[PDB]
Amino acid sequence: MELPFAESWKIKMVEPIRKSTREEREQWIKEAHYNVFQLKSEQVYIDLITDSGTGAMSDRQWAAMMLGDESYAGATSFFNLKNTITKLTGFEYIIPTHQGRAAENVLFSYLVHDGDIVPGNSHFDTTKGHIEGRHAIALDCTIDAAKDTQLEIPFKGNVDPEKLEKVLREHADHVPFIIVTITNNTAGGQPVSMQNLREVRTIADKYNKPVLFDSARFAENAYFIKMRENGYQQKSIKEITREMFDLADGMTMSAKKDGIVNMGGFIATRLKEWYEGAKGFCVQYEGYLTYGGMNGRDMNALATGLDENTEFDNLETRIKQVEYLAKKLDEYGIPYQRPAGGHAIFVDASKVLTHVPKEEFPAQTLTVELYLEAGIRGCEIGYILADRDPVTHLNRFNGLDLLRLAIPRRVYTDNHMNVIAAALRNVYERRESITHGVRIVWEAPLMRHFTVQLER
Amino acid sequence: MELPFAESWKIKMVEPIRKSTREEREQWIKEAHYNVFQLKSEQVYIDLITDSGTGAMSDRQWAAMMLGDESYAGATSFFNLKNTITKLTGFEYIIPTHQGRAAENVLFSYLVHDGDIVPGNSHFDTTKGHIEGRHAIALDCTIDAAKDTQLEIPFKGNVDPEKLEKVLREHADHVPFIIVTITNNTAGGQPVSMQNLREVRTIADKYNKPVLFDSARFAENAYFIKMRENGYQQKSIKEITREMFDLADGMTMSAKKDGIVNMGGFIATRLKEWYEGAKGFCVQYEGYLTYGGMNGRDMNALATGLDENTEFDNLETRIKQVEYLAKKLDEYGIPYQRPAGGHAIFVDASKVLTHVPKEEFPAQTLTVELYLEAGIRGCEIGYILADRDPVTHLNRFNGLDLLRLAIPRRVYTDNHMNVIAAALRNVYERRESITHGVRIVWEAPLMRHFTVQLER
Amino acid sequence: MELPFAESWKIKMVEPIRKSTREEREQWIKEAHYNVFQLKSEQVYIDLITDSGTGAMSDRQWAAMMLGDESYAGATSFFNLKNTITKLTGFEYIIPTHQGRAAENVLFSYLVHDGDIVPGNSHFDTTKGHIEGRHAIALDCTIDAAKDTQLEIPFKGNVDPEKLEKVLREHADHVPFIIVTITNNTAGGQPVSMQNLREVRTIADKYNKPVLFDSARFAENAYFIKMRENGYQQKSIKEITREMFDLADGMTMSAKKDGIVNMGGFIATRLKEWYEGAKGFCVQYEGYLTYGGMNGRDMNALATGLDENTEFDNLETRIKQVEYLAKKLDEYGIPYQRPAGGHAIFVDASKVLTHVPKEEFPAQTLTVELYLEAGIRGCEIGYILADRDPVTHLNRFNGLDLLRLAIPRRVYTDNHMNVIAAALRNVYERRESITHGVRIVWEAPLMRHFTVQLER
Amino acid sequence: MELPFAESWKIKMVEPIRKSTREEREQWIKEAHYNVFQLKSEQVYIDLITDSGTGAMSDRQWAAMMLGDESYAGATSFFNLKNTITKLTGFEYIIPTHQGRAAENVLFSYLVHDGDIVPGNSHFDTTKGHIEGRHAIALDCTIDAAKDTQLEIPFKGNVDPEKLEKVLREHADHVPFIIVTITNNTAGGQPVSMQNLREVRTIADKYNKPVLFDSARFAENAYFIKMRENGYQQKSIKEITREMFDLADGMTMSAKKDGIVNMGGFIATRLKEWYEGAKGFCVQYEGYLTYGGMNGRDMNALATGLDENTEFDNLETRIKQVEYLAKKLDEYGIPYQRPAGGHAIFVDASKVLTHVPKEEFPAQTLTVELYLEAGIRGCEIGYILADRDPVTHLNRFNGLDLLRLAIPRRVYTDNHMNVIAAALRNVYERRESITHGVRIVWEAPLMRHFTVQLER
Ligand SMILES: *Cc1c(COP(=O)(O)O)cnc(C)c1O
Numbered sequence A, B, C, D: 001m002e003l004p005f006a007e008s009w010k011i012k013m014v015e016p017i018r019k020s021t022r023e024e025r026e027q028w029i030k031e032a033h034y035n036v037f038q039l040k041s042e043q044v045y046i047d048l049i050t051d052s053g054t055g056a057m058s059d060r061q062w063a064a065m066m067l068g069d070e071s072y073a074g075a076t077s078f079f080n081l082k083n084t085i086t087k088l089t090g091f092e093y094i095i096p097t098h099q100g101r102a103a104e105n106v107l108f109s110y111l112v113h114d115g116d117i118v119p120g121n122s123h124f125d126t127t128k129g130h131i132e133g134r135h136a137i138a139l140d141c142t143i144d145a146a147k148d149t150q151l152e153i154p155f156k157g158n159v160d161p162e163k164l165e166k167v168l169r170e171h172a173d174h175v176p177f178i179i180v181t182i183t184n185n186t187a188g189g190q191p192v193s194m195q196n197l198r199e200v201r202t203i204a205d206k207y208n209k210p211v212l213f214d215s216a217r218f219a220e221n222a223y224f225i226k227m228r229e230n231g232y233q234q235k236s237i238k239e240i241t242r243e244m245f246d247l248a249d250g251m252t253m254s255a256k257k258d259g260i261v262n263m264g265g266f267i268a269t270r271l272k273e274w275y276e277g278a279k280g281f282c283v284q285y286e287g288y289l290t291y292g293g294m295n296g297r298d299m300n301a302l303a304t305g306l307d308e309n310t311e312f313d314n315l316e317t318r319i320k321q322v323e324y325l326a327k328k329l330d331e332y333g334i335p336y337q338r339p340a341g342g343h344a345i346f347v348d349a350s351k352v353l354t355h356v357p358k359e360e361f362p363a364q365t366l367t368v369e370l371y372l373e374a375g376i377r378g379c380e381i382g383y384i385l386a387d388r389d390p391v392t393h394l395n396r397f398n399g400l401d402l403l404r405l406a407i408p409r410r411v412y413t414d415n416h417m418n419v420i421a422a423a424l425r426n427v428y429e430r431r432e433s434i435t436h437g438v439r440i441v442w443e444a445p446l447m448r449h450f451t452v453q454l455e456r
């Protein structure tokens, strides 16, 4: 009697998926040294390694790409992108960059100095790389609830105001800025509340500090505020977006997420000092100030995607697919970081491969098993990703050990989601049989997960 | 434990769907005079009016379009298309046309003369137009089982050999050729067996007549032979395709169906007499002999699509979506032409709007109701489409009265299919309440369904 | 001191040109039986066989194609095209067709009956085919000056009002309409004056007859009115366009010319009787009334191209290239139809191959020689194209014998134009050596030039 | 009698050019503070500010873009690009980056340490930025002839072997590698001979040093070797390309030049130590090792462009346009860096605005004048670009003071080139009238030319 949900868009172009045998996968995963980053695209059946830059654009984004201005200085495509951003966020100063880590690279080489601490909620791992690489400290202040995977709360990505107050009371003198990541990617794609953004703003104001939003998934965050925060049920995504950024002094964004483009990023800010200070590094690292390592056609696609993905229906379609996957997982009893976030499901490996020693890397082992089972490639957000202690050279076994299933936007159907959950069900139903994980054979000094070799 | 089915492709580009209120639809269906062909695209939520030319192309088809040769004579794109066709069918003579009815127009103005009878299984309605328009008779010889909607048989589209033998014994002298439509579109997208194609070939051979295949959905037909005809379980689609056309003297094809292109068609044949006889009409009606009203980029896309859609996985994905829709209909008890065909579900209106007089057009009434309910546009394959008797000026109430739900290829998800079936469920569950249909206000002389005005 | 002219556009995408040896061309022209329509695209170096549908679209046309609505009924792309046409011409009734001869096919099967005469200026050869094919007479009333190739006048394509008055005084009863072709293609792409369009309108009004414009190159015509007709120097192309069509009752158009699209056409009219009378034939020959054998993406490209090519700068760039080619021809003393027209140069073969008997087809011989010389493919607009007398079966040697050099829009540079003129210079400078032309070996009944076989 | 030259390609898509009045330009150049980098694209009529990334791709590059694999790890598009590079250069290790300065950024943060000297021929200015920014010295060893603008020699970009020998004899201990830029961009796009590449290789071998080629225009360089170096007249571009890179240990390339793509770059090398040492910086600055800040569709376009632009005809078409521009300049007596190079004409401002003090920046003044005259935007390669001395804070007035006219590949016609030369003629013919240049109002610390404000 009630019409069931369906996507607010329809398909205009397709591309093939390749299928494979378990015998083929056995040898392919061996030739990759059991590191899925080393698997070839052609060897993956359903690729969930990340939602970054893997999504399908719309017909209006492709039309925008046919109008790209490729001129080196002052392209119409850049002012197009610029005005869209200012319109949507209120920030008047825009620096284009080619991706998110380039925006961090450009901005942090002005703002981050040796010895600084940069507090916030959970820093994404390229973001942490650009802070620690400058001999600064990325200080996690996420609420403790984030590490209770089965605890259900509406805004598990929030910053604990007590934790932030403490760092600033003790080190305000070497705190150059506060960074809030929305949604909170590494805590499992969990949203941050408008209340919490005001909390952060009020504390930053007491200590006269600027606030930076890592904004890769700000649109997913605005959807969660609309759906869960009382007082926002009737506001538009565009309304909630502007309210959010009124509480920030600047943003950095990998547009490869909530722009739904295959490439692109930017810095945007209200502070002339930041704009002027970062300009030099964009010219040296990315390109001239009006393209920043982005094609004209790519900034056009981004301008259109930012406007398109700040509309409710499009966000709703994306996030209900993620929730549908969760629903299937729940149906099979497979534990994950609750409640389902915006962009991915984070399967709690500690509670799936229970017969595998933490020292033998369970989440990485689960990654391998799922790929062997059905050719589905996920990504480990656990012990290997967390790196070794720089002085003790010891592994860090006390954090979450998760298998991330990141969903490229508007690429896979809910039938593919059924295959994912079923393949995961099969692995889960043989847990009392999975007793030895993996062992690092060769290992890099930093961000080893990209390049680590392994056995078994 | 067994992995469920999923599509053998993934999405690369999307476009929006527009939603509407019942109040908007009320006025829009009135301003169309309750003829859905007159509704604007923007006023339809899910468009099932036809699978012809409405499908989504693949990335390799779009790449092929970037290489289109637009030269007026001898484009590389034409020889590309030509060699693909000869390769796949064995026919050496190809005449390009812009669509299917153009291929009929071109070929029948050489072959069809006044007074001829053209027997076959159920002739599609543009095909019938080009025979009757030349004062010839399109004689239906489909097996009688086709009109038993609830009877389940594997090849309900077959030609009855007794019926064909009879016409030829009586009128062989004015029979210019036999036409077999594969799949049988107007009988509900029902397949024709390889056995039946040999039956037709043997009778045509006895009377020394040529055989023409209306081939718009020959690929769907080959899939049904592979899946249902004993002795073909292990043959490739490309194998079955060639076997099929070895039994024909020529083909006519709306490539807008099983080419999965938005435009295109052709004649192909093994008879030099046919090739030479139709050439003049292509130049006069369509264009020069090496493009035939088709862009170079469009013949490239067609060449690629013919090769791509003669592969099992792609056909399987398409046809299981249609079967999934059927499964939902069965779950709600909604009657249709069994078993589900290749491209569409034909809801049996006689058994859904049982409280509506045949004189008040039930299937057309159901079309209107479904659009009012959920904005889904179907198409009436019943009394209105069947036209009036040319001499008696009376409606023909003894044929099937169906609502066709045609599925554009690779456009809608199985979630959209759930919405379709649910919307249809709702209409069905209020059948004891739907007592007056529609009345023709203005009416055309021939093919009135495109242009007919109606009330209530 | 004065800046020289340059194109009002720049290049955004290129494609290759193939070069060849004279030995290769010798065999290729033989395997084509010295009919250049039979040459493969790959065997031509510079293709001037026609400007119809061979042009390069703009970035905004390609963007429009990414937004094409492929729905079968009521596509947004069709109403887009429709409103553009009504805006630009004042005609409210539009019937889409896939090309120009389809628009003639559709409209003349309502308007042209056996025994009618259809007077006008020089009828294009598909247009003449659709009149003579219906057993009607296409009566040329072009001013006699058109056949004086070296006479320079501003509007050599005009209709002689005395000639038109005469036919109507004698046969008004069997004249269904008057047709004016703008520009006058077969008289050498020569314009028609606004004065002459009023002359035609006033005579048609005296006899209460409707006027139809064959409008394939109406934009080139408007440019010539702006540049040569006193009183229009300061009017916009869009202004002149509307004034022109205010004097017509309907138009037929191959948009493959002044739309600068690779496919497309339409009928447009102010007469409901014409609209209603042609509707049935569009459904039977072309497609449903809202696409007419055109892709949605193709009607979008057409909508944009009609607006873009009714702007002065774009027309000026096109036509000055044609004039530049003429300037080079004049520099080498090579005679052509003066003054240069809109879309092509018509070399007067009678005055170039003076040592070749008219019976041995000089213009066709020149076509072959130019291709042998430099791989440039032109087209014969002379004795072969003019056909044999239907009763006497004799060739018609009293008309112009021309080699048309048609320039695809925005495809070739002025450097390619230099190559053309130089290659033609070389042939011309050896005229006292070129003494035997060609002989028809095999010949078709009608429009033999497409399909004629020849020797020497 | 001899056919003149024409382009080996034809046009497939166009985009508009905007025209303007001198009054508009007056205000636009003022609102840019007489810095043309600050002019908006829409305010430029013919944009010659750079050939980097501004060119028009081919139909096969656009087809390749429709097949781009956007997967984050192991995209088919990356191995496509990789194998093309290895095939063409013999280098087996490839690191993708988004542009040229990113490839320098990634590679030099492994190779360049404080106190090093990096000798070579004239270092491009982002390249110099990445050496000097690491507190190293970029030591120019170009032959002295390069600064004699009117001296005509075949390989004016060569490295002086005496100069290179000297640096290595004195500082071999702090020389990490030798860099050869081909063609020599900042010396006026002047080629380097194969002989000179062997000279460099032999000296580097004596001191056991590796050689790096800045390879942005290696294809133009191979064309000049084929056309000017004795012993290479009959070798293919692909042959000369491989011979060239056999003498290098690695390359860095802005593919935005001789790839003819709008974005892209890479490092390629034969040294595993370099590959392994740079990997970490690609992940931190550009992206994962199999896309490096490049779209899949962009690496496909690059793969195709590298193969396409290592073919003689395509290079010949490009470079003869540059030579044609030179020919016109010579015709008007306008001095430039002789002989014309690959990609641009460098007008010698010292010999054009002779009535302007060097302290008032003549080349920058000429830039402004040409833009005022005809809306043509060039770029100053003179005193402003050369920066101030880091300790003395004094301008460096002893180098060349040039106005670079960089030609985007396959964008502008030879008619646009005529406009360029004519506009430059007009400025030149009023030199005895141009007596005051410009004055720095606001000035940046480094690479001031991008961001410098000026007056008069
Ligand atoms: C993806 C990611 C980034 C970095 O963006 P890239 O485009 O991959 O360089 C930054 N922040 C978050 C939260 C991310 O998920």
Ligand SMILES: *Cc1c(COP(=O)(O)O)cnc(C)c1O
Pocket: B052, B099, B100, B101, B102, B124, B126, B127, B181, B185, B214, B216, B217, B254, B255, B256, B265
């Ligand atoms: C679609 C259809 C046609 C006609 O093709 P068009 O491209 O629409 O002209 C012919 N035969 C069958 C079976 C069809 O379904």
Ligand SMILES: *Cc1c(COP(=O)(O)O)cnc(C)c1O
Pocket: C052, C099, C100, C101, C102, C124, C126, C127, C181, C185, C214, C216, C217, C254, C255, C256, C265
């Ligand atoms: C091209 C032509 C036509 C016919 O158009 P097509 O698109 O080729 O069918 C009609 N009139 C004129 C003047 C033409 O040049």
Ligand SMILES: *Cc1c(COP(=O)(O)O)cnc(C)c1O
Pocket: D052, D099, D100, D101, D102, D124, D126, D127, D181, D185, D214, D216, D217, D254, D255, D256, D265
């Ligand atoms: C363009 C240029 C570079 C830098 O490349 P970008 O893509 O602009 O970062 C390096 N070397 C030379 C010779 C250049 O001309």
